[PDB]
Structure formats: C-alpha cells, structure tokens
C-alpha cells in the first residue's frame, strides 16, 4: 500500500507548509506532527542533519523542505509539465526561499530582529514583487499552462510577508489574483479552512 508519511515541524506554517499543501492537493494521508520549540533539541538529536522540516517515508527520514516537495510532486500534475518547466519551477522557488531565508527568524535580540525585518520589507521586498509581477505577466500561472508547486510556494511566502506588510501587493493586482486562484483550489481551500491558525 501507500507509504506511512509523517511530517515533523513546529506548530507554524513556516517551511513545512509547502509539503502540507502538496499532500492536501494529492489527497495523500499523512501525520502532521507539530512540536513545541522546547522539544527541538531532543528531536534534532535523532536526525542526520540539524533542521526541520523532515518527512518520514516508511522507515526513511528525509530532510530539506524543497527537496521533499520536489520528490513528492515528481510524476504528478504539480510538477512542471516538461524538463524546462521543472527548471523554472525550481528557480522561482529558490528565489522565493532565498528571500524568505534572509529574514533573521532565529535572532534572539528582538530589537535587531525588528530592524532587519523592517529593512527587508521596506527596501528589498518591493523589488522582488516587481520582478515576480514582470515574470508572471498576463499568464494564469507562474510556469507553463497549469498550476505547479511554485504557485503554491508563492501563495505561502506571500501570506507570511503580508502579515508584516499588508500593502505589499497594492501595486501588483496580478500577483493578488494568483494568490486567490491558489486559495480557491478546492484541496487548498479545504486545508486553509481546517489548518491550525498560527501567525507564521
């Protein structure tokens, strides 16, 4: 039968949400294991590397959110439809992840953390939004003729950015339309209704 899938991450959307969307879209059953921050050192001690999310697939522990997402979407409708499309999917996702990963999520000094979030959102985020809008143009989805997991990743990253900067897309209605289209995909809409509500 199907594998036993167990996703481990914090009780946040964060870096695990892309995998959660993929499982929902593919209608694949999984255990959505959410740990408290206090229990990270114990979990970490059991892993080959030093980060979450990780995905157990039967007896195998996978790591790296995008490596996992790519694996789960291979040979599904969420992959790019062609080899080149798969390159473009990968590139857009890495561009989004690169930007999200610039935020000092783990900075313990709160004043330093807030200053850097504000700088990134005020002076850098608009340039990424403009690059993404130009890249999308008048097309329905970011890559090819149908939805890919890059579209999911756009909606996920932008949801978190909008928490901190609600007017991020005021000048980019086409990027708003794309978010709404992802959110209206039935399996995604259903997951959004039912998922734990967390800030991040």
Ligand X SMILES: CC(C)(O)[C@H]1CC[C@H](NC(=O)c2ccc3nc(-c4ccccc4)cn3c2)CC1
Q: Shortest gap between Cβ of 24 and Mg ion (angstroms)?
A: 16
Q: Please tell me whether residue 118 binds Cl ion under the rule CB under 5 A.
A: no
Residue 37 neighbours by CB under 8 Å, 6+ apart: 10
The catalytic position among 5, 9, 21, 153 is 9
**DSSP track, 86-138:** HHHHHHHHHHHHHHHHHS-TT---HHHHHHHHHHIIIIIHHHHHHHHHHHHTT
Q: Is 34 annotated as a binding residue?
A: no
With CB under 5 to 8 Å by kind, the binding choice for 160 among ligand X, Na ion, ligand GSH, none is: ligand X
Cα four-point dihedral sign 179, 138, 146, 81: negative
Catalytic residue check, 9: yes
Do 165 and 125 contact (CB within 8 A), yes or no? yes
Q: Is 156 annotated as a binding residue?
A: no
With CB under 5 to 8 Å by kind, the binding choice for 188 among Na ion, a copy of itself, ligand GSH, none is: none
Q: Shortest gap between Cβ of 28 and Cl ion (angstroms)?
A: 12
Structure-block tokens of residue 115 = 């200053």
**Region 78-137 residues binding ligand X, contact defined as CB under 6 A:** 97, 100-101, 105-106
Residue choice 11, 61, 64, 81 for contact with Mg ion (CB under 5 A):
81
d(CA 77, CA 156): 19
Q: Give contact residues for a copy of itself (rule: CB under 8 A).
A: 48-51, 57, 60, 62-64, 66-68, 70-71, 74, 83-84, 86-88, 90-91, 94-95, 98, 101, 127-128, 131, 134-135
């Amino acid at each position: 039968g199907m594998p036993n899938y167990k996703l481990t991450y914090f009780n946040m959307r964060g870096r695990a949400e892309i995998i959660r969307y993929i499982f929902a879209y593919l209608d694949i059953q999984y255990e959505d294991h959410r740990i408290e921050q206090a229990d990270w050192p114990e979990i970490k001690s059991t892993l080959p590397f030093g980060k979450i999310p990780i995905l157990e697939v039967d007896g195998l522990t996978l790591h790296q959110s995008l490596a996992i997402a790519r694996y789960l979407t291979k040979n599904t409708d969420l992959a790019g439809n062609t080899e080149m499309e798969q390159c473009h999917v990968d590139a857009i996702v890495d561009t989004l992840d690169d930007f999200m990963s610039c935020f000092p999520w783990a900075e313990k000094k709160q004043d330093v953390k807030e200053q850097m979030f504000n700088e990134l959102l005020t002076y850098n985020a608009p340039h990424l939004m403009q690059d993404l809008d130009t890249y999308l143009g008048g097309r329905e989805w970011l890559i090819g003729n149908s939805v890919t997991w890059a579209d999911f990743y756009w909606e996920i990253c932008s949801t978190t950015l909008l928490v901190f900067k609600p007017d991020l897309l005021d000048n980019h209605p086409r990027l708003v339309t794309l978010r709404k289209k992802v959110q209206a995909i039935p399996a995604v809409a259903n997951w959004i209704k039912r998922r734990p509500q967390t800030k991040l």
